[PDB]
Design a binder for this molecule. Structure first.
Ligand SMILES: Cc1[nH]c(/C=C2\C(=O)Nc3ccccc32)c(C)c1CCC(=O)O
Ligand SMILES: [Cl-]
Length: 260
């Protein structure tokens, strides 16, 4: 299977919106990650492309080129390959050590701060969208449901993303307006909890009960593994159900657990 200079190889991931295949560029003897889409709706794809084109940061995946033939049902987004893949699988019985979690969380902070400075809300932060690069550092992937805003913050009313990572203020049964940056912070807190415990803090196979726990169940830390108190403080602050008192990224950067 060829597509201009690219040979499609085996699958390497299903994010949101498509499937990703390893791809060999015969012109430069280099592997890439190719997202393949079947037109099934397409406005959102070209907004992801437009967002990706604006971004250039070591902790954000790099869109290389787009292959769109109007006579083809398939549309191809070529990314730079992130050779080591997602930072971890959730759930797992072998979570990261605190020191490993901090190393990756520092990259996540820098990438989110950059995205927000670029006026992008990611909306799907989770470990499987955090890819480990050649040098061991994280690259944030999958902008399939990201939002671009004008002004100081996004003012949003739509519910998108991965259910276990959705912030409780996005789960009102009344299309209320909520702000964007705090959504990414919440998902960062669920992500950090996942790093050290290997499962999400709020879990239910019944989607109604999952929504209800995100919105109303107090955060509980397992007895094991035994994590430091300042890490518990940081996670608690990011998983503040009230978005107005939830910790903000300029504070996360300063948090004692982050800086030691
Ligand atoms: C650039 C890139 N790589 C991948 C996947 C992998 C990658 O690169 N090495 C890997 C090594 C092992 C497993 C997956 C991967 C994805 C999902 C994306 C982004 C796709 C997107 O943003 O929608
Ligand atoms: Cl995940």
């Amino acid at each position: 299977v060829q597509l201009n200079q690219y040979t499609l190889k085996d699958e390497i991931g299903k994010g949101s919106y498509g499937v990703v295949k390893l791809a060999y560029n015969e012109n430069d003897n280099t592997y890439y990650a190719m997202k393949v889409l079947s037109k099934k709706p397409i406005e959102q794809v070209y907004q992801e492309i437009a967002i990706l084109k604006k971004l250039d940061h070591p902790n954000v995946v790099k869109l290389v080129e787009v292959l769109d033939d109007p006579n083809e049902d398939h549309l191809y987004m070529v990314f730079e390959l992130v050779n080591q893949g997602p930072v971890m699988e959730v759930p797992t019985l072998k979570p990261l050590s605190e020191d490993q979690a901090r190393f990756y969380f520092q990259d996540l902070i820098k990438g989110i701060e950059y995205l927000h400075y670029q006026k992008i809300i990611h909306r799907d932060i989770k470990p499987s969208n955090l890819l480990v690069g050649e040098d061991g550092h994280i690259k944030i992937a999958d902008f399939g449901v990201s939002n671009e805003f004008k002004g100081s913050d996004a003012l949003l009313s739509n519910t998108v993303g991965t259910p276990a990572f959705m912030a409780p203020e996005s789960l009102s049964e009344t299309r209320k307006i909520f702000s964007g940056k705090a959504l990414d912070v919440w998902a960062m807190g669920v992500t950090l909890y996942c790093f050290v415990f290997g499962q999400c803090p709020f879990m239910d196979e019944r989607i109604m009960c999952l929504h209800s726990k995100i919105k109303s169940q107090a955060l509980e830390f397992p007895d094991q593994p035994d994590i430091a108190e300042d890490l518990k403080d940081l996670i608690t602050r990011m998983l503040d159900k009230n978005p107005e008192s939830r910790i903000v990224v300029p504070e996360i950067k300063l948090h004692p657990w982050v800086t030691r």
